[PDB]
Design a protein around this ligand. Structure first.
Ligand SMILES: Nc1ncnc2c1ncn2[C@@H]1O[C@H](CSCC[C@H](N)C(=O)O)[C@@H](O)[C@H]1O
Ligand SMILES: Nc1ncnc2c1ncn2[C@@H]1O[C@H](CSCC[C@H](N)C(=O)O)[C@@H](O)[C@H]1O
Lengths: 259, 249
DNA sequence: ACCATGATCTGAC
DNA sequence: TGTCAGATCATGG
């Protein structure tokens, strides 16, 4: 299922499986929305939250722009797969003005359609010899067709108010796998997240957590044990199969921990 | 439309457009059949010819081969997308025995399925970290379902005996482009091809020449001029600066 | 490509 | 026999 934008570690492929395990609810809370592949494909009302505010402001702005408004900007900066000079100009403009729409047009031309913003709030992703494709507005239309049920916010996960009747889906960065957004993570942040879930559990709040217990040779010991306190499902078909025809130093172990 | 095997310069994309120009005929002569994307997909009877004997013999052998036979050889050698040493072993066996079935199985494991025969007849394509796949099956099934109307030939084009009522389709190596089989072409070879087509005309025989008049700056001009004599269609669509043409009488 | 994913193919660079 | 974005086709949320 499509997400609003390309995004490292998205759940487009896993969404269908994850939904099957989702409970019934009065309000859905996507604590770490990211590219929204989760928020866009569940029943509302939805609360999509993410720490990276510049990205949330882009979503808030997308709600009121047409594809034409987007093509108008691409035509204005004369952007193409070979327009490095113009890509740099557009990047400079966004870094100064912080026009949310200019950021959306930027990602379409950056390296791997990735959005890398430093602490100063500026876009550092290099040109990617890319541009919109005959399927770029497919995501855009998916977003427009499902944004009406969503309420965005850009707060640190700790500051989000969870209420009775809500279901909390958590998909934080993963220490064991590389990802630009790892910069916002540390062991400390994870402990607070883990502490936070237990609370919702003791408050009659159902939640769901995505993560990886193992990868390439490392492991998240602390989480491995913590998870034994709930219901666990191993989503990576390859890791599951090789447990029986294994050698040892193999791949990733994707899971969905839900109370 | 698929050919019998992947092949650089195949006409799988152009065949539909080309056929709308082909006449009726008593016999279709595919002078430079290559991967057979044309031969397997036109009404027969057909005469499929190519100068590369190894490939033609592979086709001749293929007629008497079942997919399970292909799989038996793959098990026997234990090939896979990571079996580089077993690939080298199969290649060595083919090079010594020259058995066509081994070539067929071997080409599925080489880079882009390319069949590169060197100066002494040995297969030298590098391992391609790949093996058979659904396309392999599809092409094989397509060959078996359409090989009945074809008679194969492995001769230099000037040696093939063309008859009355024949339609001679020719898709030779293009001077302007790059292909491994260009080592068989040259200005002189092309000169004689154009002379033969003229003879076919003098005899009242229909032919169709696929080719390139312009590609990457370079241009073929005796062909441009020689073209003025007959009908020409430009198929350059969607690929850039190239000017794919079809010259027929 | 079609609903969407993903394996594979192919034409620029 | 490199890289890879976009296209093609098989099939499974
Ligand atoms: N303290 C924090 N609070 C909320 N979100 C945080 C955070 N630290 C990092 N993140 C967010 O963690 C997200 C992990 S990616 C989650 C991906 C998402 N489910 C999808 O399908 O695309 C990033 O978007 C990052 O901005
Ligand atoms: N002198 C010659 N006589 C016959 N065939 C020749 C030749 N010199 C080169 N060739 C053959 O020219 C072919 C050009 S490729 C033609 C491709 C074919 N229509 C397809 O759809 O696959 C090659 O297969 C090459 O072996």
């Amino acid at each position: 299922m499509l997400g609003a934008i390309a995004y490292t570690g998205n759940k487009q492929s896993l969404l269908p499986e994850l939904k099957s395990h989702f409970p019934k609810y009065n309000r859905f809370v996507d604590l770490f929305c990211g590219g929204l592949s989760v928020s866009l494909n569940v029943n509302g009302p939805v609360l999509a939250n993410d720490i990276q505010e510049p990205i949330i402001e882009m979503y808030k702005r997308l709600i009121n722009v047409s594809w034409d408004d987007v093509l108008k900007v691409i035509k204005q900066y004369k952007l193409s797969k070979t327009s490095k000079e113009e890509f740099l100009k557009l990047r400079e403009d966004y870094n100064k003005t912080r026009d949310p729409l200019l950021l959306y047009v930027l990602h379409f031309h950056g390296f791997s359609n990735m959005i890398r913003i430093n602490y100063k709030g500026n876009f550092t992703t290099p040109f990617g010899k890319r541009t919109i494709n005959k399927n770029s507005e497919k995501r855009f239309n998916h977003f427009k067709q499902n944004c009406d049920k969503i309420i965005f916010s850009s707060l640190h996960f700790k500051d989000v108010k969870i209420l009775d009747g809500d279901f909390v889906y958590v998909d934080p960065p993963y220490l064991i796998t590389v990802a630009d957004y790892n910069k916002f993570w540390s062991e400390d942040e994870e402990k607070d997240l883990l502490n936070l879930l237990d609370s919702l559990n003791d408050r009659g709040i159902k939640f769901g957590l995505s993560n990886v217990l193992e990868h390439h040779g490392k492991e998240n010991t602390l989480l491995k044990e913590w998870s034994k306190k709930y219901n666990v499902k191993h989503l990576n078909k390859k890791y599951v199969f090789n447990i029986y025809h294994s050698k040892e130093k193999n791949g990733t172990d994707e899971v969905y921990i839900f109370n």
